[PDB]
Amino acid sequence: MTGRQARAPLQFLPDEARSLPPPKLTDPRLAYIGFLGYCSGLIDNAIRRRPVLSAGLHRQFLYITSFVFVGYYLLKRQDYMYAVRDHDMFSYIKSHPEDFPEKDKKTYREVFEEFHPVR
Amino acid sequence: LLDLIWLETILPKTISLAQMKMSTTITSQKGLIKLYFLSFLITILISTTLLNFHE
Amino acid sequence: ARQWQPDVEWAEQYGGAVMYPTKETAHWKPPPWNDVDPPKDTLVSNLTLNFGPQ
Amino acid sequence: MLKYIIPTMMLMPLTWLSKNSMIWINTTLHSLLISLTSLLLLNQFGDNSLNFSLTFFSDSLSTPLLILTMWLLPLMLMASQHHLSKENLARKKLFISMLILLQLFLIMTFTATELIFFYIMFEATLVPTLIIITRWGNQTERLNAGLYFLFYTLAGSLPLLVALIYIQNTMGSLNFLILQYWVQPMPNSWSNTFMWLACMMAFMVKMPLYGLHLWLPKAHVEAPIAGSMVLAAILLKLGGYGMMRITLLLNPITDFMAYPFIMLSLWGMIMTSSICLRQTDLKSLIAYSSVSHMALVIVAILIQTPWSYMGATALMIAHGLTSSMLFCLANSNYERVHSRTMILARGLQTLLPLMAAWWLLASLTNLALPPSINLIGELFVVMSTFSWSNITIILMGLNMVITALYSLYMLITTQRGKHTHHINNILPSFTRENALMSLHMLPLLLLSLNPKIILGPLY
Amino acid sequence: LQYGPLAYILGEKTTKKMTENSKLITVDGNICSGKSKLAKEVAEKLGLKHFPEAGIHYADSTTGDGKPLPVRFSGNCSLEKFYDDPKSNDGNSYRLQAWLYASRLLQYADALEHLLSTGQGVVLERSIYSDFVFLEAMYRQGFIRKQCVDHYNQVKKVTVCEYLPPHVVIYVDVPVSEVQSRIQKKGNPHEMKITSAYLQDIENVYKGTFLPEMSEKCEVLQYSAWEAEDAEKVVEDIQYLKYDKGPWLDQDDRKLHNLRMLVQDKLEVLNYTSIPVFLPEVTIGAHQSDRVFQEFTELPGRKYRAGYNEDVGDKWIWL
Amino acid sequence: PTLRWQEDPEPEDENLYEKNPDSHGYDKDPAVDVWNMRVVFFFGFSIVLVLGSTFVAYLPDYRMQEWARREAERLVKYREAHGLPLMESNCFDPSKIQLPED
Amino acid sequence: MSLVYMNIMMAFTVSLTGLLMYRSHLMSSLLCLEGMMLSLFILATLMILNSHFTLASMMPIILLVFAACEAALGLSLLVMVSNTYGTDYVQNLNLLQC
Amino acid sequence: MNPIILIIILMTVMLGTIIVMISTHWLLIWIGFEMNMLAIIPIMMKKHNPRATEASTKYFLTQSTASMLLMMAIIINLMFSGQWTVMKLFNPMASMLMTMALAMKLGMAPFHFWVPEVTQGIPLSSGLILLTWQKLAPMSVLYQILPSINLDLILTLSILSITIGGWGGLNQTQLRKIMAYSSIAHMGWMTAVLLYNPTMTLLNLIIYIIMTSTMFTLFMANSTTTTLSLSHTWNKAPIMTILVLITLLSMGGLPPLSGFMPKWMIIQEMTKNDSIILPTLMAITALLNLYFYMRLTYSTALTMFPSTNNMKMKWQFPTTKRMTLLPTMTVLSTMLLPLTPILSILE
Amino acid sequence: KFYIQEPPHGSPNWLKVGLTLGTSAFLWIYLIKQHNEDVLEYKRRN
Amino acid sequence: AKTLLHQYWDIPEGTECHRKTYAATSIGGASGLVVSAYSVALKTPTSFLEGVARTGRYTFTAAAIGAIFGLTSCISAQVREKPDDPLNYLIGGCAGGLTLGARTRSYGIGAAACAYMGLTAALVKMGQLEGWKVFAEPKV
């Protein structure tokens, strides 16, 4: 699938992206991102011989902040991308009724499928 | 007889010998340049005309 | 304490230029550990000119 | 179900921020608390499974295996000391957290809904087993054991992924219900034969079937006791659980394409019970015993009777308990003498006069003494396969005879007749091994009383 | 540490702490002859800092607590057991030789860092060049398998060939019997067990190999036996030395930047020390090394980054 | 003239007894081993085993058992008390079936 | 097809096989690289002239100046190899074995 | 070397690669590849040992002839329909020459003979930078000009690079050669799905770049060339061991770990077409290139080789290399599994 | 005390920690303000 | 090339015979010349008579396996009179592997070659029999 208005420049988040619902506070994905950031600060203590859980508390708070922020922007972009994919799908559905015909519901009083028993 | 020696010589050992021999004939190439460029040339000819890629 | 550990000969099984021995790979010598050969100092003399009597 | 997932996570930073003489009580106590916590689960009733979310659910195939897992962790965690208490504190903490992450992926695996998620959690079940058995493999070929291990399990389990993605984008999503309610039969074109072959062959590798059981014996003779109990009980019955689920699709060609595997399983069941009659390395007899019981499992899965699936799940749970117990007893004997061989450590009716009671009890369960569960399993599988054919009972009964004789040989070889009287170092039995035997053989007899729980979906 | 490019861009260059006193003077002498006597004399006269003798536990000396850490760790050298019995099959010549080689290399790096940082030049005693000559005479005695000497040749080829050799070298020649008399004057019995032909072979290689191979790299002044104290003469000779050859005249600044950024992070220096060749006289299996590393963690002042080290303090871990 | 090793002579076989004749399972720390015994029983049998025995000895009708007993009782009594044959074959209604034709 | 273009393409294959098979000296290889450069230059110039593709007629001289400074780099590399060795054969390079 | 000059050379590498990304004219793309070569040549020969000199010679020769054959492809494109817009081409022969130029450029199965030789005799920083930008520069071009390529070219080079970087790879303990054959195998994967969905190719490019940056950063933390040197890194420090474990397993691609995610999406949007046998072949050879990772892990952190004293000396100095950014890249590279629908962040 | 002739560091530098915590509070407040504007814009349009 | 593999598969199989074996020998000659061309590029024989000898051995052996494959293909198709199985080409691949082991004059290579060439040949005819495209859709 391709841009779809790369004409219409790169535009990290379009101004049509201010109609979708935003990712809320403490949504679980960015909670996971913050856990990853805490672990990144913790291994950041661990590479050098500075002791774990302590003497790096500003670095832990830093890595938490930065990863939660970056994940927040990417969550907004991700939601926009799925919205534009769904709307283009439904637009191509409605644009041509001629090729996606309605499967009339053959209910099971008349549908024949064989048996082939497992003894 | 059956489990140990034949089942190890059918499922692992065939694979291990195949991989070991093929390593020792792919990457056992001494380091000159004229070899690599003759390989390029025969690859270009055998990709253009013999097993064609532009037709 | 009875948990087995490999030996000098194990490590030398993983030692050498290449991994697998063949007929052909005796000549693969190990690289220098500093990635620096002891190069040829091929400059035997400077430019020696014999200006004669012309 | 997240009520079980999240304390199993939070048992992990526990083990980090405890100290010396402080990790142990916390881990063991809280793991037993989680065992009660999943003893709460068993509600399952009637119409269908029970759904723990838009994402998780439990078939009644999954409930006893899941409870078995949360039972088997604290037992294991007690069992794996005195062979590593003299190693370092950090490495010991890493060991305990490795097992907890292992249990976490096992719960993830058993409570799956989507078969792709099941596959991810299948190989996430794999990777701690590797690290445990290689880091404490305790003999000179733990190298080769881990190498054989991971390449058989992945290279069998690799195209299973391809087959499931193909089914994903030919029949919609992959709920077990929407795998059900929508499955249509698939005829005998050769692509169908290869697709069935891919799925069934990957789980065949994980059972093992007979032509792929030399995966096993290195990976149990050169393992520590924790990874061995894990590997045997949880991983082999995990492979069986996977085939039990995904055999719902592709019933109309399993009849035509199931003939070689049954015959492989039968003649290999006889051959494996024969090959564990004469080996040394007592630890390996339990491994070949496990291949014998899993061959009977595979017979029960490829025949498709509800009788057969009831017998299959009972044989799964009973053999898991028998093999895990008997591995723990063999580790007790190896803690006694530094041999692992069979004919060396002898006597022991005199000395440790109640260790022999546990040997006798496990040996008679592996005999399938009749009130136990293992006879329930084997008996219903024999009933179902005799309705399959009027001829296979030669093989089943001859399996019963040779199983009786090697199991009795394990009993009266090492623990009968004469101590070699140059041993003079074995200690009288600790409380710990007695506790481990007590934790195995109270639930086996307690299910021997009331076994209507552990029978499968086709109860 | 405030370095990398950015110190070299804030500060203009580094040649500004030069010269005529910022230099490397190095007293090479035979044992109990060319020592810290004349070295401290010329260091105090000439206005130039001094380095004590490179002992066994120098690496233990240069970090945090300068007490010698117990010789299970810094060993297993046992220099007095070397002067006792250089014939043991447990291996105590060459283990000690590798250890002293690493000690001389570390203290040379510390000296060259103190030269290139602010000056003002230093004296050294018994440098790394004297160390290989020392070992080759030890092999002339024949205490060592020749494969182990091949290993030493390998380590010597790798490590030394990135440095600048020192400026001036003061050779002290004392004959054999006077050194014999002096080691009798000191009275230490382990030192009294020395034999004289070992000392003679030291003098042999130390004249015959060292002098042709220095050759105006490390310009030399050769002095006699009672030519010691004698301070004014050697200070005077350095005063009119007329520096003639050597690679020190070709840096110009860029190699000096590389040497400042190389000699700092001494672990980058010592990333060629364990090569390995596995030398069954030398190496250590997993089990002994693991228990020794865990006991090295059990020290109260060595564990997890001496900067942030608790149980000495430091009350800045941000609560 | 060679050794290839330098380590301790191995093992060091510690009898876990002969410094404690009262000792339970693990190593020679005296009190916390007694705590190990007390936790693995009192939270391993005294709270797990007998409570699990009650809890799985009975709970409701797992997979609808006695529900099915009494429901079949009432249905067979009805199909005796209204004459019609018990367990009608052809479980789906043949009026609501359509055979495809030849 | 403006017939001459056939000959210049065949000349390109001449220069390319001369670049690929080469026996003794690296300098012959580098000079045949220069010849290949001349070939592309000429062919593109003929087409841009006969197209009257008059706006972007820079292609000949800019292609030229770039791949000529490539040849300058190649000259310096050959000087460095010839400086640390005696000669500049394709042989005496068999060290660093693959 | 001057540090100002190194900042200059990095500026020119970045200028060249950004020119390749950003331009729409064919002359500009060829300028971008040439300037990329000219700038990356003195990052190699950073020292002055003759190993780097022969490496740079081989690299210059093959790189420059790939550049000129690329220019041949462009002048064929103007021999046919002539305009300088980076679009669908107008000759199967031109597309053939052009993809063979890029296959020589980024390292590929007929053309990979300079990759281990260029990596073995160079330092670690040079190897890292050449892997990053010399795999990043052509992918933009191929992502552009995909709609006019004979497929058998791309698929042939993908398959054969995956199996060459497999089978070649079982034989080297020179860690630069191991990492180079790893580069070949992943570039086979990343060339493969170019004609199906290029989102997968670019995501795989991101994941591969971050993984190799983690691996080379771990080698730069303690300078090693052999596996035995990694065993000494076991003895001297323990956390480097578990990092080598995690990053080698994420090069191996196991489903608990983040390196599995590029395999899985490729197999998905490959097998929605009629290509099934080609996925199972690719993923079997992806099982193959895990084995040297596994023996490397067995060398480092799981068994332990005998150590040497003077590690006793190196205990007294705590570590003091700067990592450029190691831990951030590591747990960006390895715990990334529950963010697979950050797939569609990319298109 | 206890550290001969150099610690390489050990007294906490005060520009860097205050700078990082100030910019971390700044980035928190900036994303909070952006988020509140985004919630308001979503609810205002729909 | 596509022309001669197309000539091989265009024969109804079926029996239109000895054209099948001629096409299979042409396949063998082509494949032997390919792999021998890489080998003579990457060995430097010296003498050149050895180079011609090695290329002749490779071409001759690949043509031999092609001939034996086509022969037992034709014969099994005529005898069994059931042209749809892959079993007849399973016999084909095993016979080809056996004579590969014959012309290299060791028997274990012939055994493993029987197994793998039989499995590949059964899969080739079987995949033609169902229809699995060459390399692509490449649509969606």
From Swiss-Prot, chain B:
May I ask which residue range the UniProt record assigns to the signal sequence?
A: none
Report the transmembrane regions from the record. 31-51
Q: What subcellular compartments does it reside in?
A: Mitochondrion inner membrane
Q: Which family does it belong to?
A: Belongs to the complex I subunit 5 family.
**Assembly mode:** Core subunit of respiratory chain NADH dehydrogenase (Complex I) which is composed of 45 different subunits.
Q: What does this protein do?
A: Core subunit of the mitochondrial membrane respiratory chain NADH dehydrogenase (Complex I) which catalyzes electron transfer from NADH through the respiratory chain, using ubiquinone as an electron acceptor. Essential for the catalytic activity and assembly of complex I.
Can you name this protein?
A: NADH-ubiquinone oxidoreductase chain 5
Gene, per the UniProt record: MT-ND5
UniProtKB/Swiss-Prot annotation, chain D:
What's one Pfam family the UniProt record gives for this protein?
A: Oxidored_q5_N
Repressor found in the keyword field = no
* Record bears the keyword Lyase: no
What is the main EC category here? translocase
Q: Which cysteines are joined by disulfide bonds?
A: none
Catalytic activity, EC: 7.1.1.2
One Gene Ontology term, aspect cellular component: mitochondrial inner membrane
Signal peptide region: none
Recorded catalytic activity of this chain's protein: a ubiquinone + NADH + 5 H(+)(in) = a ubiquinol + NAD(+) + 4 H(+)(out)
Transmembrane ranges, per UniProt, are 22-42, 60-80, 98-118, 147-167, 196-216, 224-244, 256-276, 284-303, 308-330, 351-371, 391-411
Which keywords does the record carry?
Answer: Electron transport, Membrane, Mitochondrion, Mitochondrion inner membrane, NAD, Respiratory chain, Translocase, Transmembrane, Transmembrane helix, Transport, Ubiquinone
- One GO MF term: ubiquinone binding
Q: Where in the cell is it found?
A: Mitochondrion inner membrane
Membrane topology of this protein: Multi-pass membrane protein
Biological process per Gene Ontology, one example term: mitochondrial respiratory chain complex I assembly
Q: Which family does it belong to?
A: Belongs to the complex I subunit 4 family.
Query: Oligomeric state and partners?
Result: Core subunit of respiratory chain NADH dehydrogenase (Complex I) which is composed of 45 different subunits.
Role of this protein = Core subunit of the mitochondrial membrane respiratory chain NADH dehydrogenase (Complex I) which catalyzes electron transfer from NADH through the respiratory chain, using ubiquinone as an electron acceptor. Essential for the catalytic activity and assembly of complex I.
Q: What is the protein name for this chain?
A: NADH-ubiquinone oxidoreductase chain 4
* Gene name of this polypeptide: MT-ND4
Swiss-Prot record, chain G:
The main location class comes to mitochondrion
Pfam families, per this entry?
Oxidored_q2
Q: Name one GO molecular function term.
A: NADH dehydrogenase (ubiquinone) activity
A GO biological process of this protein is: ATP synthesis coupled electron transport
Localization (cell): Mitochondrion inner membrane
Per the UniProt entry, the Enzyme Commission number(s) are 7.1.1.2
Q: Where are the transmembrane segments?
A: 1-21, 29-49, 61-81
Q: Which residues form a coiled coil?
A: none
Catalysed reactions, semicolon-separated: a ubiquinone + NADH + 5 H(+)(in) = a ubiquinol + NAD(+) + 4 H(+)(out)
Highest taxon in the source lineage: Eukaryota
The membrane topology of this protein is: Multi-pass membrane protein
Q: InterPro entries from the entry?
A: NADH_UbQ_OxRdtase_chain4L/K (IPR001133), NUOK/Mnh_C1-like (IPR039428)
What EC class does the entry list? translocase
Q: List the disulfide bonds.
A: none
Listed GO cellular component terms? mitochondrial inner membrane; respiratory chain complex I
The UniProt keywords, alphabetically, are: Electron transport, Membrane, Mitochondrion, Mitochondrion inner membrane, NAD, Respiratory chain, Translocase, Transmembrane, Transmembrane helix, Transport, Ubiquinone
Q: Report the sequence similarity comment from the record.
A: Belongs to the complex I subunit 4L family.
Subunit structure, briefly?
Answer: Core subunit of respiratory chain NADH dehydrogenase (Complex I) which is composed of 45 different subunits.
User: What does this gene product do?
Assistant: Core subunit of the mitochondrial membrane respiratory chain NADH dehydrogenase (Complex I) which catalyzes electron transfer from NADH through the respiratory chain, using ubiquinone as an electron acceptor. Part of the enzyme membrane arm which is embedded in the lipid bilayer and involved in proton translocation.
- Recorded protein name is NADH-ubiquinone oxidoreductase chain 4L
Native species of this protein?
A: Ovis aries
UniProtKB/Swiss-Prot annotation, chain H:
Enzyme class, spelled out: translocase
Q: What biological-process terms (Gene Ontology) are attached? A: mitochondrial electron transport, NADH to ubiquinone; mitochondrial respiratory chain complex I assembly; reactive oxygen species metabolic process
Entry protein name? NADH-ubiquinone oxidoreductase chain 2
Coiled-coil spans in chain:
none
Q: Where in the cell is it found?
A: Mitochondrion inner membrane
Swiss-Prot/TrEMBL catalytic activity: a ubiquinone + NADH + 5 H(+)(in) = a ubiquinol + NAD(+) + 4 H(+)(out)
Which EC number(s) does UniProt give? 7.1.1.2
Alphabetized GO MF terms: NADH dehydrogenase (ubiquinone) activity
Look up and give the organism this protein is from. Ovis aries (Sheep)
**What is this protein's gene name?**
MT-ND2
**A GO CC term attached to the entry:** respiratory chain complex I
Membrane-related topology note? Multi-pass membrane protein
